[PDB]
Design a protein around this ligand. Structure first.
Ligand SMILES: C[C@@H]1C[C@@H](O)OC(C)(C)O1
Ligand SMILES: C[C@@H]1C[C@@H](O)OC(C)(C)O1
Ligand SMILES: [Zn+2]
Ligand SMILES: [Zn+2]
Ligand SMILES: [Zn+2]
Ligand SMILES: [Zn+2]
Lengths: 340, 327
């Protein structure tokens, strides 16, 4: 019954305010409006043509995803990935797509973050969840963290501060991994040393690897497996070294078949899927957004328009695909009880 | 004729006594807006900076050059607010310091030139406030990216006439490599201040650069960890040379004939988030005068050493105006 109930119930924070869990609907759990650096969009909007050009590009892209069935995206851009929550709020309103904003730290923290203690980082993450981001009043609904191989000492602090903020607020944790180095195992160990429940943790970029034994072992422990970069592929772009380095040479079909493999091995309930797409991208080489758009014009609509029909023909029932894209994110994003 | 400040353009005669290397807040891009509670609050930081700039003003300072770049967390709206409430001109900076994020580190020399030009010719962010100086940095041998920033700074200076000021590891003679790269771009040494030059005691390094026409930034005079020897982080940042030792380098360059090329400052701040947490309180505990340290302590020290008032006015008024005046 309660799955049909919109006008009451528990709540997820978005850039437009709280929404009920049922309103979230089809949710992409790892996306970006703009992948940048802190303060960069405000200091140099001409890098993106203009701020207005970026807004208009993002609103059209979100409308394309919405027409394909998407109702919510989780923007896992942190402070140091140049998250501008005022941009998210504007494009969410214009496109009528819910956007959940993130706290945490990604792979480019400035000195003012790198020098902080685990206690200080915990207060910063709590601030963005409990008080709001900057002076906007918009509260983060997820905590994003990152490793790229064996964790640095600072990255361990970030992982611990994220676990502590999650336990205190109930909001979930989502991670960036170097999947081929099995980063999720060390992340899991640190999270579990802090008492964090695996069901509150998504081990991301897990479709970057073909090692099913690594993925199923994490899923068997209750971790969520983020198969979040399905359209990332430089096939056909072999003469472009920067695009090949970033997007890899594994096909989207290979990445998507990992979704079916986890389903076949009984781990449907542990799967989250996404595109890891963006509408602006300044933290890499200059032409990269144009290159990515030439590869995947569907943008964030790639999961519903391409991946779902591909898995359907492979025999995955629609109800299973709806469970992965609607129910699984709703359980992930719904805050748990605060500790104490 | 005019110098751009955070309150708009001013004429050369309005600059007056000018501190040429200062910071309202040493931070990181976006950090003040995202975590103002690190500084107590934004309002507390404003109040502290206004009290400090008002004390400097009462001591005779009329202008400071805030050499905080994008990646040092420059918030030009903060600079404008504090400048207005203390009635002290503030010149803002473009360029890049020692902590550029990926979106900067990945850019070409042409792209960086366009960014520096934007902040000088158009304005910083959406504020309409234009930079009046370009800040660059090395810490020993330049990284490949730092070479790009030095060349972009030279190109922006040549296009606009605004000067370049540098951060050095002075004991590694970084000014020599900076000079080499600048001159390979056709930049005049008279448009360049080699900063943190009081961090070294090698007079021959400084005089050779000044004999080539460079300006010499003796800009961290009150930086000293004397009395803080049990504090490893303060000692590493501030050094164990006394302020008197740093100030005597001013007199030495005067005595060697370079008074027209000396620029003096405090390199002080009112907030400081890019280092260890307690550092601003520690620094304030050894120099309560803050930015007033140059007029209240260094000036009398040099006057007792026999430096005439006309020479000290030349260094603190004439030189900064000549340096900041475009082209
Ligand atoms: C800012 C984001 C982070 C991660 O999702 O990688 C990509 C390349 C998509 O950039
Ligand atoms: C932000 C400023 C930059 C440079 O002047 O170093 C100090 C330590 C004084 O911090
Ligand atoms: Zn990532
Ligand atoms: Zn991402
Ligand atoms: Zn410096
Ligand atoms: Zn400085």
């Amino acid at each position: 019954i309660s799955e049909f109930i919109t006008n009451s119930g528990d709540r997820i924070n978005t850039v437009r305010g709280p929404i009920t869990i049922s309103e979230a609907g089809f949710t992409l759990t790892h996306e970006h409006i703009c992948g940048s650096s802190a303060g960069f969009l405000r200091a140099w909007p001409e890098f993106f043509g203009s701020r207005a050009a970026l807004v208009e590009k993002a609103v059209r892209g979100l409308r394309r995803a919405r027409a394909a069935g998407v109702r919510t995206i989780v923007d896992v851009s942190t402070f140091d990935a140049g998250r501008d929550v005022s941009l998210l709020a504007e494009v969410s309103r214009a496109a009528d797509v819910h956007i959940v904003a993130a706290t945490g730290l990604w792979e480019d923290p400035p000195l003012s973050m790198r020098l902080r203690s685990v206690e200080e980082l915990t207060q910063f993450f709590l601030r963005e969840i409990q008080y709001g981001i900057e002076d906007t009043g918009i509260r983060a609904g997820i905590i994003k963290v990152a490793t790229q191989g064996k964790a640095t000492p600072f990255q361990e602090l970030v992982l611990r501060a994220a676990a502590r903020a999650s336990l205190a607020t109930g909001v979930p944790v989502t991670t960036h991994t170097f999947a081929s180095q099995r980063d999720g195992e060390q992340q899991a160990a640190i999270f579990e040393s802090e008492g964090l429940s695996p069901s509150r943790v998504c081990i991301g970029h897990s479709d970057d690897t073909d090692d099913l034994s690594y993925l199923t072992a994490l899923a068997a422990r209750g971790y969520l497996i983020g198969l979040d970069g399905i359209p990332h592929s430089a096939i056909g772009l072999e003469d472009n070294a920067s695009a090949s380095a970033l997007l890899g040479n594994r096909s989207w079909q290979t990445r998507a078949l990992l979704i079916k493999a986890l389903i076949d091995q009984g781990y449907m309930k542990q799967i989250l899927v996404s595109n890891d797409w963006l509408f602006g991208f300044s933290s890499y080489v200059t032409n990269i957004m144009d290159v990515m758009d030439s590869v995947n014009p569907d943008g964030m609509a790639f999961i519903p328009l391409r991946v779902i029909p591909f898995l359907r023909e492979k025999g995955v029932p629609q109800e299973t695909l709806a469970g992965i894209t609607v129910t699984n994110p709703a359980r992930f994003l719904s805050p748990t009880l605060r500790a104490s």
